[PDB]
Design a protein around this ligand. Structure first.
Ligand SMILES: O=C(O)CNC(=O)C(=O)O
Ligand SMILES: [Mg+2]
Ligand code: NI
Ligand SMILES: [Zn+2]
Length: 331
């Protein structure tokens, strides 16, 4: 078995190897990369996502989210308070303000210490989930707005034609902006490209050990657990590396820098934080190996997790028994 300790693997494809996206994913899996839940891909030196970032300041963040925490430093939830619209230029200036900027630090490890010590005492503002793309249309390799669609994968594997579309999302981050512990909708893959700015630190649990994280989360968030049988789908709960180590949960960590891709694999729980002003682009995707994960994925039916138009069809075809109750949650 390849990668039996489930370590995060880092790949350096040549420009020749960067042509065929599906084939490279399948290569990484042949080496065991999926066992970690997360992999890093460093693009060939010749590749670029676009020529410059010089003209992005007029993108609008229609609903910036203030991430307010409750709990203790290592075990907390966050809620998202909606703020007034602002441009990317306005948000960058805010991120660089004395109130919101990255503090002085020695290295990534000192910054990680300061994040876990201090996160809960501040409420950073995240421009998340903005439909759009920063890839130039002429970038032919690993262009996240030109991938094969999940609907077309389901049709190729299973023969069934379904409605829905699959488009990318932009994330504008600042110091302390946080992504809670989650897997993807329908336990899909995700791919994330850090276009510019400061790094993003990731934590991940191997897919084969995901249920260990779920059991800890039910113990640590006991009212949330009674409210919903899949409450990590609400994307609100944080648990620190120190707390995971104290409870024997297997995990790994890695820092993504500008110009690098990350891939999350089906049922790979992940969480993390931004080091400073940055912009990432991400999208879900599928392969043949995903289909069985999609059939087994948990679902939120309490009504909190409220998800896309395109997830309807996935539930309806892969989980027809759940269909009914899950759509009661979504209406
Ligand atoms: O970058 C973020 O805030 C969150 N991204 C992801 O969870 C991902 O790409 O799967
Ligand atoms: Mg602009
Ligand atoms: Ni994710
Ligand atoms: Zn729920």
């Amino acid at each position: 078995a390849q990668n039996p300790n489930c370590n995060i693997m880092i790949f350096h494809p040549t420009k020749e190897e960067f042509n065929d996206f599906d084939k490279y994913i399948a290569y990484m899996e042949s080496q065991g990369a999926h066992r970690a839940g997360l992999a890093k891909i460093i693009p060939p030196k010749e590749w670029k996502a676009r020529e410059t970032y010089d003209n992005i300041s007029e993108i609008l963040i229609a609903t910036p989210l203030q991430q307010v925490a409750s709990g203790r430093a290592g075990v907390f939830t966050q809620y998202h308070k909606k703020k007034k619209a602002m441009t990317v230029g306005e948000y960058r200036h805010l991120a660089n303000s004395k109130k919101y900027q990255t503090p002085p630090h020695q290295n990534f490890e000192d910054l990680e210490r300061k994040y876990w010590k201090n996160r809960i005492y501040n409420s950073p503002i995240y421009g998340a989930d903005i439909s759009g793309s920063l890839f130039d249309e002429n970038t032919k390799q690993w262009n996240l707005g030109h991938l094969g669609t999940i609907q077309d994968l389901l049709e190729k594997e299973c023969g069934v034609v379904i409605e829905g579309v699959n488009t990318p999302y932009l994330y504008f981050g600042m110091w302390k902006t946080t992504f809670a512990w989650h897997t993807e909708d329908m336990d899909l893959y995700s791919i994330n490209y850090l276009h510019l700015g400061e790094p993003k630190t990731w934590y991940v649990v191997p897919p084969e050990h995901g249920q260990r994280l779920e059991r800890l989360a039910r113990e640590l968030f006991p009212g949330s657990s009674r409210g919903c049988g899949a409450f990590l789908r609400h994307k609100v709960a944080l648990i620190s590396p120190t707390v995971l180590k104290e409870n024997g949960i297997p995990f790994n960590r890695i820092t993504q820098e500008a110009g690098e891709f990350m891939v999350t694999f089906p049922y790979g729980y992940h969480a993390g934080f931004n080091h400073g002003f940055n912009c990432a682009e991400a999208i879900n995707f599928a392969t043949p190996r995903w289909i069985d994960y999609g059939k087994m994925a948990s679902q939120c039916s309490c009504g909190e997790a409220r998800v896309t138009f395109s997830m309807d069809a996935f539930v309806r075809i892969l989980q027809p028994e759940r269909y009914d109750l899950w759509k009661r949650g979504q209406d």
